[PDB]
Write a protein that binds this ligand. Sequence first.
Ligand SMILES: NCc1nc(-c2nc(-c3nc(-c4nc(C(=O)O)cs4)ccc3-c3nc(C(=O)O)cs3)cs2)cs1
Length: 319
Amino acid sequence: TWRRFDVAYHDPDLDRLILAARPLLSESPGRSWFQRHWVRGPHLELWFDHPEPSWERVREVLGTHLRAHPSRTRIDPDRLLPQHRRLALAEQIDEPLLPFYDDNTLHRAVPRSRVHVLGSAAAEDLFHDFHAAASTAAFDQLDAVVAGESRLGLAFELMIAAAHAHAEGGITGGFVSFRSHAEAFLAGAAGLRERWEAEYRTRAEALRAQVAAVVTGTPRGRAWTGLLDGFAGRGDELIASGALTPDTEFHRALRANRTWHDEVLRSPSFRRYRLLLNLTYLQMSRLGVTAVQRSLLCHFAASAVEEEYGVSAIEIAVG
Ligand SMILES: NCc1nc(-c2nc(-c3nc(-c4nc(C(=O)O)cs4)ccc3-c3nc(C(=O)O)cs3)cs2)cs1
């Protein structure tokens, strides 16, 4: 059902290349979407379930761009291969990892299946529907970033909006997830945590204001939560049928808290929230936000909500 094209582009800043692809994902019927990926080296993937654009049309648009604005980053294959072998085990990727693509090249590629990770073809199809809708939204987000808006700031707004609209209890409920994710990432890194805290202090006033603005309602926040709304029903149904599948002070506390077990973890509302937050994190990846940066945002979001509302995620976890 799907066609895939890989654009090998070794500079981590894909944003202009993505914007050049906008007509290909905007001009013909069918679902189309893009993501960033690492197999055979850094590359952009374009996915289509209908027969247009053709390979020839894809080359007409993106060949022109690669010749005008080529990547000048050089990969280090010797260091990348072992990293990719580990990623492949972790992400359950069975595709060949070699040879690495040459920089600034276009390829047809074989679409991969994620059923074994997501739980069913129906769950995979729902993620494809999300990607199709979200990729359209991403072009406007990336136009803003290229134009000079803060990438992390746009992502922060998506996260706050998702927690306020889609968590039970709104922002002062959903923010506990942000702490959880930051503390799981940090895995005992006191020195990194202190660096994050010190940067957060410089940002606090602006970040608290952004939290209050998003909670009041912003056009971007409402647009993102509107998009997420489209997946809530089907998501609840796949979660309920089974079709959609840390040693830290915080997580130790949580594991001893019976409300976590009985009213949070197993609740359909938390499962739904967590699905829609995970879709938000996928969007952040599409927008070029790395795993460390997503985890920093989680730290900043939790800290901002705590300061604005005078609440404490660790106190909630302890119970
Ligand atoms: N002493 C009794 C109590 N314990 C709790 C707890 N709530 C949580 C909680 N945890 C996560 C978490 N998310 C993660 C994650 O990894 O995503 C871990 S904990 C997300 C959200 C909540 C809350 N929901 C609400 C709501 O009003 O509905 C408020 S706080 C953990 S213990 C509430 S009252």
